[PDB]
């Protein structure tokens, strides 16, 4: 339990946020690898 | 048939052969990339599953709910990959429903949705698409796990089905259990493990779910690319065989046409 | 037996480093090749890997899992683990100050908690850098 | 030497030509439906 947990934020969202922060921390030289790791391909069917 | 029909069919089959060979080369390149990317993913998945490998984490008894994760792609022409995973998920659904357990299925591949929607339409929980068009990555798996938790289906017991890559020609449709429930995570082995708590173990289990989803996605994409290459190669071979047969037929028809027209001309000249 | 690898890159596989410190969600922990088996959730921070040899390694990691079993096999799984050099200290400070500025922007408790995750990650990044 | 050209699959009028025509029609019917929905939503404005 923390400020994020038990307040509407899933731990997966926590991981996404910290991973995005780390990727943004990377310089533009290594930004291509960060974009490669970032997966936005999967969409939703409902 | 006539000369024109043979020519049309032969040209169409030639074009089909060229397209199949080009797709075979494309699938070979994608298979090489997936094979390169699989090794870190393989290590990551083995590490994620190591905790449950070294602990006898087994479901105690019957559970009302059960989620089945059928990992597949949207593209076709993959041979029996989607067929095998669909057969496996159907068998598992029937077996678990025979015990009176509520069965829900999540399919990351539109092909799985199409195959199972004729019968298992209601059991679909959340369907995903655009899988296999680009190499899978941990972001997509994280999104899938996030919406799986957000779906509101608190499955006490879970499992995942995917086609594990064994070799360039061989693959195995493997089933891996998922103990996403916090209570089922706690067992006799967790007594030895320190700082287990409840929330920490819950977050760890969610992250392990994301990790196994990512590992299954990588294995499935490697298997799909290998099978795509093999199927395109077989299609190209069949097209080439048909091409040579039709070429022989076309030569026979061309010679027959020439002979017939010359015979008509000669008969007309002689009857004059 | 240290198993450290991101979803994309591999750092250590069965390495006998015998000393690893992880930024756990609850705090900090130290592996000593005999540490009590436990499962630890990673927190925005840096994993300073201390090999058996005198040399050490410093990698800033995202959230993840620290799985140390009864044996020495530790499977450290970090979502975004990179060395400190690839990062930018100036961009680090800029992101930290912008996130501090935008912390109050998110009226929702969950969204403000998310921005708090952001500021915490940036603060750990600043301390590492 | 006998050769081929571009767009010879539909010229033969075999199974593959009809398959391609049906696939194109089914895809573009959905695309036309989506475009009509978007145009109606725009025209409501």
Curated annotation (Swiss-Prot), chain D:
Location in the cell? Mitochondrion
Residue segments, region N-terminal inhibitory region? 1-21
Q: Where is this region: Disordered?
A: 1-17
Q: Which domain of life is it from?
A: Eukaryota
Q: What does this protein do?
A: Endogenous F(1)F(o)-ATPase inhibitor limiting ATP depletion when the mitochondrial membrane potential falls below a threshold and the F(1)F(o)-ATP synthase starts hydrolyzing ATP to pump protons out of the mitochondrial matrix. Required to avoid the consumption of cellular ATP when the F(1)F(o)-ATP synthase enzyme acts as an ATP hydrolase. Indirectly acts as a regulator of heme synthesis in erythroid tissues: regulates heme synthesis by modulating the mitochondrial pH and redox potential, allowing FECH to efficiently catalyze the incorporation of iron into protoporphyrin IX to produce heme.
Q: How does it assemble?
A: Homodimer; represents the active form and is present at a pH value below 6.5. Homotetramer; represents the inactive form and is present at a pH value above 7.0.
Question: What does UniProt say about this protein's domains?
Answer: Forms an alpha-helical dimer with monomers associated via an antiparallel alpha-helical coiled coil composed of residues 74-106, leaving each N-terminal inhibitory region (residues 26-52) accessible for interaction with an F1 catalytic domain. The inhibitory N-terminal region (residues 26-52) binds the alpha(ADP-bound)-beta(ADP-bound) (ATP5F1A-ATP5F1B) interface of F1-ATPase, and also contact the central gamma subunit (ATP5F1C).
Q: What family is it from? A: Belongs to the ATPase inhibitor family.
Q: What is this protein called?
A: ATPase inhibitor, mitochondrial
């Amino acid at each position: 339990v923390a400020y994020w947990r038990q307040a509407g934020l899933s731990y997966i969202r926590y991981s996404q946020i910290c991973a995005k922060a780390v990727r943004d921390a990377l310089k533009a030289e290594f930004k291509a690898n960060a974009e490669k790791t970032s997966g936005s391909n999967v969409k939703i069917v409902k | 048939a006539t000369l024109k029909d043979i020519t049309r069919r032969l040209k169409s089959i030639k074009n089909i052969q060229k397209i199949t060979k080009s797709m075979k080369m494309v699938a070979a390149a994608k298979y090489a990339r997936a094979e390169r990317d699989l090794k870190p993913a393989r290590v990551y998945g083995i590490g994620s599953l190591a905790l449950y490998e070294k602990a006898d984490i087994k479901v105690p008894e019957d559970k009302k709910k059960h989620l089945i994760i059928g990992v597949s792609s949207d593209r076709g022409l993959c041979g029996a990959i989607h067929s095998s995973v669909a057969k496996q998920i159907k068998s598992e659904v029937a077996n678990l429903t025979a015990a009176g357990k509520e069965v829900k299925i999540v399919g990351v591949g539109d092909k799985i949705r199409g195959i199972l929607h004729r019968t298992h339409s209601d059991q679909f929980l959340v369907t995903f698409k655009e899988v296999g068009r680009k190499p899978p990555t941990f972001g997509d798996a994280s999104v899938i796990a996030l919406e799986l938790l957000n779906s509101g289906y608190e499955f006490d017991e879970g499992s995942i089905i995917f086609n594990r890559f064994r070799s360039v020609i061989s693959y195995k449709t493997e089933e891996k259990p998922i103990f996403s429930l916090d209570t089922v995570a706690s067992a006799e082995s967790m007594s030895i493990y320190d700082d287990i708590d409840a929330d920490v173990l819950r977050n760890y289990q969610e992250y392990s779910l994301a990790n196994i989803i990512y590992y299954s996605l990588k294995e499935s994409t490697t298997s799909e690319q290998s099978a795509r290459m093999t199927a395109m190669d077989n299609a190209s071979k069949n097209a080439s065989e048909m091409i040579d047969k039709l070429t022989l037929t076309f030569n026979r028809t061309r010679q027959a046409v020439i002979t017939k027209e010359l015979i008509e001309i000669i008969s007309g000249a002689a009857a004059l | 037996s240290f198993t450290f690898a991101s979803p994309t890159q591999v750092f250590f596989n069965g390495a006998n480093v015998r000393q690893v410190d992880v930024p756990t969600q609850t705090g900090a922990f130290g592996i000593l090749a005999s540490h009590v088996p436990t499962l630890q959730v990673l927190r925005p921070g840096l994993v300073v890997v201390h090999a058996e040899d005198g040399t050490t390694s410093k990698y800033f990691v995202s959230s993840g899992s620290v799985t140390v079993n009864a044996d020495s096999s530790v499977q450290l799984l970090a979502e975004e683990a990179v060395t400190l050099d690839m990062l930018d200290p100036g961009v680090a400070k800029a992101n930290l100050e912008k996130a501090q500025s935008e912390l109050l922007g998110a009226a929702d408790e969950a969204s403000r908690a998310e921005i708090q995750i952001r500021i915490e990650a940036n603060e750990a990044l600043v301390k590492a850098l | 030497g006998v050769r081929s050209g571009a767009g010879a699959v539909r010229d033969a009028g075999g199974a593959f030509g009809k398959k391609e025509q049906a696939d194109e029609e089914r895809y573009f019917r959905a695309r036309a439906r989506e475009q009509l929905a978007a145009l109606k939503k725009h025209h409501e404005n």
